[PDB]
Design an enzyme around this catalytic site. Structure first.
Site: not given
Ligand SMILES: [Cl-]
Ligand SMILES: [Cl-]
Ligand SMILES: [Cl-]
Lengths: 290, 292
Positions: A100, A208, A269
């Site tokens: 990730d 982000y 994931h």
């Protein structure tokens, strides 16, 4: 574990917390969102049988320092934290495994600083150039990335994610797992403790805001990004609810070095939680290979 | 068309542009994003064989006025614009057909002002109470609504959508269509002209900022919304990239009057462009070849 040790070290102007077990070749395990070192709980003791395993909390997370401001979470600085960590641990290079955001940081570290990375392992993390170039033309990726756009807004995401003892975050994880009981109540208590650290949620969301804002996602032009010059292994859970397979096709254009990809068609994931032994096996084999 | 006429009228403190064709029973066609009256180009001359058709540009769009400020795009104000338009056209009511935001506005107008709506036709627009209650609990809807979250950011989405003669927006539309050549080169020129109107993009995005910001999506309150008391037809293209079927099923609390739903399994969000004749036929049958 009993043999797991907690440590703090100064790197790149911040203090970083990490856990470690083992002796020998340095192997870094780098988490992503909304995790911390503990996502590696299965791999740390297994890999520690043959390697010096270090699993840090990234900048902003859990017990690591949490500088204020979106600008302090640009990928260049996050990769410099890891470059600094390898130096601070007394090695010229490390095997670097990233999942990730930890994988995005690992691609970046390896591209700009190949001398510090002996071998690269990526779990379910798109190459920065792949996400930047491809996302705008992948409706499936744009839809999977709805929450990336949500997280751009100030204040509201912190509120929504934290409400009702982090019900959203717990749900996000569960919805991503390929069996939905993958975390225990003990795990969840430990996760909530890390999530509740002062400033941790805002700092995590700043990754982000700094690196996946709409200007970056919808950039008209491609970025310059150095080729990867070290042997690279990608482990990819195909039922990833956050990342489309569109984003992992053809990494060899980005890699001038041996490359291998191991697809897990029935994992999502969190591949390292879903097939912990197979993941460990692939890592160990790839590292012992030369 | 040669028989299509452009008009402007003052309603609810703004000047509204509309096109009109035909005589007889008043029928409104209400576009959504990123359209304007011209999305109805196929339906207007065909429906004008039986109706006085009026297709306005909504507040903020194309030739209609574009007040500054997010607060000027709340749904209650948008519905009051249409209530005002019906009055301004000299009738006590109209048949109201709405697609996308025009459909959300039509649900709202009909709920709060049923005397002004003869019959309601909705195309690919969720009932406000359904979207408000259900979105936060539907991963598939949250994913489909990625762009609703994108549009919340100030300035950047306007820049990205408009750059390179609206390259983004053209792509967004194409990815949403399940038929080829819905937009011809001529249509694209016309679309770009409407999109490029000063303030139009910001105003269109303000619908999302005013009515679908994250506080509203994730609110733990139930909304008050009156029951629908006029006969209602919902037309729903199932391959809708923007709206999950989660949001259109189960209307039972919401509508008191007779209700019918027509699903189009092989159409998407722009059902009126993809099956224009079948859509027109269902509208005509519902409106003029009714039951009790
Ligand atoms: Cl690419
Ligand atoms: Cl698998
Ligand atoms: Cl169909």
């Amino acid at each position: 574990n009993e043999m797991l040790k907690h440590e703090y070290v100064k790197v790149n102007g911040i203090k970083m917390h990490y856990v470690t077990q083992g002796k020998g070749k340095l192997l870094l395990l780098l988490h992503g969102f909304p995790d911390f070192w503990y996502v590696w709980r299965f791999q740390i003791p297994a890999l520690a049988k043959h390697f010096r395993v270090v699993a840090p909390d990234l900048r902003g997370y859990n017990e690591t320092d949490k500088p204020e401001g979106v600008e302090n979470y640009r990928l260049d600085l996050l990769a410099k934290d890891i470059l600094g960590l390898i130096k601070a641990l007394g090695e010229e290079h490390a095997v670097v495994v990233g999942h990730d955001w930890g994988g995005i940081i690992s691609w970046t570290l390896t591209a700009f600083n190949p001398q510090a990375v002996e071998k690269l392992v990526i779990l379910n993390a798109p190459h920065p150039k792949a996400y930047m170039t491809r996302t705008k033309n992948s409706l499936r990726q744009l839809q999977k990335s709805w929450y990336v756009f949500f997280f751009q807004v100030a204040n509201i995401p912190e509120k929504i994610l934290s409400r009702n003892e982090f019900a959203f975050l717990k749900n996000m994880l569960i919805q991503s797992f390929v069996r939905r009981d993958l975390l225990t109540e003990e795990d969840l208590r430990i996760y909530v403790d890390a999530w509740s650290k002062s400033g941790a949620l805002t700092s995590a969301l700043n990754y982000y805001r700094a690196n996946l804002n709409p200007d970056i996602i919808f950039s008209e032009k491609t970025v310059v990004f150095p080729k990867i010059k070290v042997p690279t292994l990608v482990i990819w859970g195909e039922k990833d609810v956050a990342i489309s397979k569109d984003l992992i096709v053809n990494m060899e254009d980005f890699i001038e070095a041996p490359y291998s990809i191991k697809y897990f068609p029935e994992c999502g994931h969190w591949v390292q939680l879903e097939e912990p032994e197979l993941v460990r096996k692939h890592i160990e084999e790839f590292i012992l290979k030369s």
